[PDB]
Amino acid sequence: RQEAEQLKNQIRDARKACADATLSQITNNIDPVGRIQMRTRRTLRGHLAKIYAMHWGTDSRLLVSASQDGKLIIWDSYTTNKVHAIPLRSSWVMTCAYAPSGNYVACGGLDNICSIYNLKTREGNVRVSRELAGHTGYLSCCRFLDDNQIVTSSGDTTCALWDIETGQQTTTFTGHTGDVMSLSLAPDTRLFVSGACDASAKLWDVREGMCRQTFTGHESDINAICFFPNGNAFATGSDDATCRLFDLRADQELMTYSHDNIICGITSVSFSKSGRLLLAGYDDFNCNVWDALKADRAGVLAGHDNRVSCLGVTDDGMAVATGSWDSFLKIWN
Amino acid sequence: LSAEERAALERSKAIEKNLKEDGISAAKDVKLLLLGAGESGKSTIVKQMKTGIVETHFTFKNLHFRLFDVGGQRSERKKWIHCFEDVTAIIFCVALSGYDQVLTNRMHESLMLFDSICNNKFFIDTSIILFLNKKDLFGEKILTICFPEYTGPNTYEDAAAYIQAQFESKNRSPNKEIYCHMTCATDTNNIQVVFDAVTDIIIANNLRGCGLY
């Protein structure tokens, strides 16, 4: 224990040894973005219960949503048409992902299972391809790497990589001490960061299987995590009403995103196409747009009538989708 | 709006038809939580109503009940208990014979868990059916090592009424009730107790929807 406390002091000493100035000194000369004025271009209304997850497709037109009425809906966001409606075998679903090929969607929740659905069947329907059962928690998040690998987080304090063809865990990512709540893949899919209910975020090597770096600094449960488009930073929302920006090469917390009129939790975070904006959905039914370099709140999204549970920016950056507990998706632009 | 776009819109409208019909069919059910503490009588109650979440269905008087058992979830409740916010009622299970058994004490843990789920901000207007289990076992084990302030008689009736009043003293809300009952793990119809309590809950919800309750 003495050696571990010495190592903690050594890591803290080196972190202070690399930390002469902060982003408020470097990004002080830069001009702001003003007010951001977005409006609801679309409203996707087909769900009959709380919406827990959504995920955009990489063509920036199709998107899944999940809700507790037991349905996955594939949406056409330009025409507001619904392309599919997938009936779920368990309605207690907390996450959903779209495959970057377009051929598959995943979902899971309190069943402890990640079910995978083929959207491209000769029979003309959507059927369950696989069901991935190795977790003992509840499925918190899942993201496809490709058509055969998916990384899942769960509330048994672990993460896992899966071979979809065999249905078996390839590697398991242990080291958190609380329920893992979110994950985000690096834009080359060789690393991912996960945030858990122990106020810390961890950088994981996908091929090897061991934690590279650990990022403490929040005060409560980390609920959301998203990667920076460069791949050398990530943002992190939590229950202490604060988003924080971290840093991979500096191994350091860079900036907090807080305000005195914000006391609720942060359900979901996302970056824009370049950086410069951090979009975060909150429990107070709203969504707040931040300036990523200057910590100035650049605008609000006053839409939904219950808490904004999920949000996502398109792959080309043309729009933002937010879903919420009042059963509606809204496209903002 | 071309030929293939009219047919995609017709397909979308057919999907919407099926979604509304599934919602009408799903609104007829009665959803219920089961939230007891460990070895408390939850398995006995789901036996009388016949790793993830377990759902048991039963039919009684042309109504369909859905009881959800979340005991296989050994995680933090604070991250999934909001999934059951619009449930109709909660069934809580307490072993009356656990007043003297230690794991601390077994029934003080039940008081802690009942106060936790009763004063939750997601179950402010959700009422509770409280089953006090192990009635005969308490009848032959029978209090002042669990409640030393009790200073009263040592008979079954008054002790059981004391535990019930001490358990219902943690409500602190006008819009909800606790419908208590005692079960000796061989009672013939505890589905009737749930049916009567759910009837009272729906009458109170409908009167509260008119400005009358």
Epitope: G124 | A3, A8, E10
Partner: single-chain antibody
């Protein structure tokens, strides 16, 4: 896999009646719209009728209007074509075609085998010439000119290519002018802009031999080209 088996085609005296029946198996019949496409014994595919997925939209041709009636029974997985007043202009091989419509789908992607029946403004699609000889290994450009521009305002150009192997049903190659159907090599490719269109084969094998058809799907009625056969010089 998926099958569509037509039944009910025999000799009928002129002015009579006959009912065709297509029996489906191996897919979700109720989610697909259904088509009848006939082929006269000389040459050429042409469209007859369309019933939608929930049997709520029905279209006919002008030489079909009044006399024919399309219907489907979803628990039986069958498609019907009640035909009355059978004239000499109705002797054809009749095909039932399955077709689904959402964002990004493949209409007209599986055709049945057929039944020979015997007795006794529209967008004009042109293919010139009707027969080009190819050699096994050399490329070929098969063109198709339309009268009305098939480029819609949404960005889709609704033009489909079909290949009928000699003796078989025709099968989908290209859908919406530039895609590639499932189970088709990348030797085939589609190109064009608005009114002129081209199918290009690269490194032609001698199993691509047959007749090539271009179909418009911009407006109803659906119109085919006259055809273009390749051969074995």
């Amino acid at each position: 896999d998926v099958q569509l088996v037509e039944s009910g085609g025999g000799l009928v005296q002129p002015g009579g009646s006959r009912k065709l029946s297509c029996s489906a198996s191996g897919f979700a019949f109720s989610s697909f719209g259904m088509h009848w496409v006939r082929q006269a014994p000389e040459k050429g595919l042409e469209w007859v009728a369309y019933i939608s997925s929930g049997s709520g939209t029905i279209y006919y041709a002008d030489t079909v209007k009044g006399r024919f009636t399309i219907s489907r029974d979803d628990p039986k997985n069958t498609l019907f074509l009640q035909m009355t007043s059978l004239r000499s202009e109705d002797t054809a091989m009749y095909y039932c075609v399955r077709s689904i419509y959402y964002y990004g789908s493949s209409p007209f992607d599986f055709w049945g085998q057929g039944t020979t029946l015997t007795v006794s403004s529209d967008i004009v699609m042109t293919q010139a010439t009707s027969s080009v000889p190819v050699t096994p290994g050399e490329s070929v450009s098969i063109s198709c000119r339309s009268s009305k521009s098939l480029l819609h305002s949404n960005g889709n150009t609704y033009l489909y290519w079909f290949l009928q192997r000699p003796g078989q049903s025709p099968q989908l190659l290209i859908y919406r002018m530039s895609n590639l159907a499932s189970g088709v090599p990348d030797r085939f490719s589609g190109s064009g802009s608005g009114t002129a269109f081209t199918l290009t084969i690269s490194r032609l094998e001698a199993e691509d031999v047959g007749v090539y058809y271009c179909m418009q799907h911009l407006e109803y009625p659906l119109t085919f080209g006259a055809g273009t056969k390749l051969e074995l010089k």
